[PDB]
DNA sequence: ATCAGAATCCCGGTGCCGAGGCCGCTCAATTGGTCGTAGACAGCTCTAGCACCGCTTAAACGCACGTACGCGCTGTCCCCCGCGTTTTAACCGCCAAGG
């Protein structure tokens, strides 16, 4: 619970300076958690559904290697 | 004279059941040939990434199965799956 | 005393962000959000940590692609601050709704 | 024919055949191809339902492909499937910025 | 105007026979071969004075 | 008489989004892709039904880019189209670096 | 060459896309982007038929080739 | 369960013969040549049942390199391979 | 040369690819060439992107390539970076993009 | 508002043409029968995922406060819409050099 407010703004300050933001309006936080979690919901749910045909009650590194395959955002890394 | 494929007379039957009522260009009867085609050859590369990321290479319906709700977006997905289930059960029941 | 009327400030973290290598978002925060989201649709599942820092590496990815089209668009806007409507455009044009 | 034993509507041996040589495995269970033939079958019935819908709309019987590319673009779930997807003949959604509108 | 001429020449490449057109374009000087066969195209420079047989000619010795 | 400005327009986009007709006539546009594959191979044929292919790709492409770009000029607080929004939204997209 | 292009129809390009008034660079900046575009297609399209080893680049090829930049049309049997 | 480490050691001795790696850095690049590996094997099995044919041999893989990597890379791959094809036909 | 490596002079195994093309599903037979000639292009690839690696952790007097590294030379890149357009490389961030908009003038 | 009048919609009409019925084939689905190992399953072992806490500390939160880009407004000036006027991308029939 409520750790969708864990998300603080001091983070996304700094993810907008890498990010190169110079100047932060203040009706964007919420909106970018919302953004953030509907993300995060479509990546677990695959990697999820991966680990149920796995038939393992744990979800390895690879397997969300593989799902995030699946929706062309690949990442590298950590082999898959 | 080399013999082309089509599956048009299929899904013709099944428009056929749920509009008996209704007609249908030829070019459209394509797309859906075209259709067919590309939502078999996702599942199938799914599957295919299945295999080997099980290090398997039977194939069985729970592979298909899970390949369908990861392509499928989920409401749909679950709606065809249970059509799928009651046909697999109605068909493995007989021979 | 030296109150500095801004402008330095803002840019100096950024070129200090853009020397940087490693992450923003810090671990166990993220990590719990992750296990809520998770709680969802099956129970009960357990995790490697490698597979969480990838999530938080692509998670960090995608915003930062998200924010460097929102900065475009604003500067577009001939305006430095940004807006809402803004990621909201900017999620229209890469088609993920 | 295993379809009509199965009560269903697709050729089963023809996916049969086009499994084994699409080299999508080594081998080839017996009821996989029943149940991705019915996965197909709704599929199919969802859309072109949709589809007669779309010509109950402008009272056309045979479907044209613009019916299709609107049925497509009006559902959410199929059109976020058929994101990357375009149709000849297809047109899009008949859409107006009121923005852009006189005063 | 460009002339467009069909010629009875032998493809060096293909060798089909009658199967080389050339296209003599000379308000720019420039004489272009083509074979209806195989498909493969040299250019060369033409004058006015220039027929098929010119730049066939200098075909030949573009690939000797 | 004289009808005031930006009507016609509108109205022809509420007629121009009825027919899916090819809006590129052939000829001119059959001119230009074999201007171009020539660049590729020299003495190349092509298929009538690939070239109403490349047809229809090209148009549905470029209708979409417009959506794209036209949203851009609005959110830009204008009406007019510019040719840096086309390199916005392009740049959002990812063609060019 | 790339100026069979027309005026009014790149102006039915932003009435089908529903776009309403028009500045001036537009269409020679569209005229490149449409060739960068099927500079990109029809190079895979001929290399699929330099495969191919004919001399007519099939329609199949240019199916595959808009598959291959994640372009999928449906329609003319693909 | 190998992974591609000497391979690349070897490359980069070869290359810049005085140079260091992480782990990591391996890691990415095995990732890197997977990727790879694997998007050129399909396309080429694509090309496979695209043309009906029962195999596949190097123009397959030629032709597919074509169609991956552009232009300037594409040219230098297929001199190399060419090379590889031709020093190892000889002997 | 006993060895297939040694009779192509690379530093690749081709029998390891010809089992993974034999354990990949991809044909149903294989010939002697093409597992030749996709890792002549694999050690190709290599060593080109390994050289805009080398100088560009050689730009930090740095011994050791990092991941910073490789990404930078990769954005440096132009055929490379449109290559990895859809592609993201592990503790990577992006290149210094500064505005001119933002520098005290 | 409010009328005149362009612009569009919408209703028989007919025509023509391809969608669909239809019909006689033949080749892959079937049917049945025969090896075989891949995998469903039982079970062993040790790792690692989890939970918890104590200590450290740097990181967030609230506020004080100026302040300065965002914005509403303004005037202005200009240059696209559009409607008008030619006008040129496509094909159709007697000349006056050949044979
Ligand atoms: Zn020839």
Redesign the interface.
């Given at each position: 619970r409520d750790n969708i407010q864990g998300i603080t703004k001091p983070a996304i300050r700094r993810l907008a300076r890498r990010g190169g933001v110079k100047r932060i309006s203040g009706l964007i936080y919420e909106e970018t958690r919302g953004v953030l979690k509907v993300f995060l919901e479509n990546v677990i749910r695959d990697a999820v559904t991966y680990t149920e045909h796995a038939k393992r009650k744990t979800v390895t590194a690879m397997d969300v290697v593989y799902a995030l395959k699946r929706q062309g955002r690949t990442l590298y890394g950590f082999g898959g | 004279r080399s013999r082309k494929e089509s599956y048009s007379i299929y899904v013709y039957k099944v428009l056929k059941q749920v509009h008996p009522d209704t007609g249908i260009s030829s070019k459209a009867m394509g797309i859906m040939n075209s259709f067919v085609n590309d939502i078999f050859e996702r599942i199938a590369g799914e599957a295919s990434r299945l295999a080997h990321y099980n290090k398997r290479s039977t194939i069985t319906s729970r592979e298909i199965q899970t390949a369908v709700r990861l392509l499928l977006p989920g409401e749909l997905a679950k709606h065809a799956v249970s059509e799928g289930t009651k046909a697999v059960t109605k068909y493995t029941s007989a021979k | 005393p030296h109150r500095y009327r801004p402008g330095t400030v803002a840019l100096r973290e950024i070129r200090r962000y853009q020397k940087s290598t490693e992450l923003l978002i810090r671990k166990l925060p993220f990590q719990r959000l992750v296990r809520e989201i998770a709680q969802d649709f099956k129970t009960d599942l357990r995790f490697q940590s490698a597979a969480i820092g990838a999530l938080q590496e692509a998670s960090e990815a995608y915003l930062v692609g998200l924010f460097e089209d929102t900065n475009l668009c604003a500067i577009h806007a001939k305006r430095v601050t940004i807006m809402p409507k803004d990621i909201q455009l900017a999620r229209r044009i890469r088609g993920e709704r | 024919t295993?379809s009509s034993?199965?009560?269903?509507?697709?050729?089963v041996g023809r996916v049969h055949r086009?499994?084994r040589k699409?080299?999508?495995?080594?081998?080839?269970?017996?009821?996989?191809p029943?149940?991705?033939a019915?996965?197909?079958?709704?599929?199919?019935?969802?859309?072109?339902?949709l589809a007669?819908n779309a010509?109950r709309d402008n009272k056309k019987?045979?479907?044209?492909?613009?019916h299709?590319?609107l049925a497509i673009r009006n559902d959410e779930?199929?059109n976020?499937?058929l994101?990357?997807?375009?149709?000849?003949?297809?047109?899009?959604?008949?859409?107006?910025?009121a923005?852009?509108?006189?005063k | 105007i460009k002339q467009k001429l069909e010629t009875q020449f032998t493809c060096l490449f293909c060798n089909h026979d009658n199967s080389v057109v050339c296209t003599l374009d000379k308000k720019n000087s420039i004489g272009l071969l083509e074979c209806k066969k195989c498909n493969l195209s040299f250019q060369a420079p033409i004058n006015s004075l220039s027929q098929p047989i010119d730049i066939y000619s200098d075909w030949i010795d573009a690939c000797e």
């Open positions: - | - | - | 295993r034993r199965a009560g269903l509507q697709f050729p086009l499994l699409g080299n999508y495995s080594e081998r080839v269970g017996a009821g996989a029943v149940y991705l019915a996965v197909l079958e709704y599929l199919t019935a969802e859309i072109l339902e007669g010509a019987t045979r479907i044209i492909p613009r299709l590319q779930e199929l976020k499937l994101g990357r997807v375009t149709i000849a003949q297809g047109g899009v959604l008949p859409n107006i910025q923005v852009l509108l006189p | -």
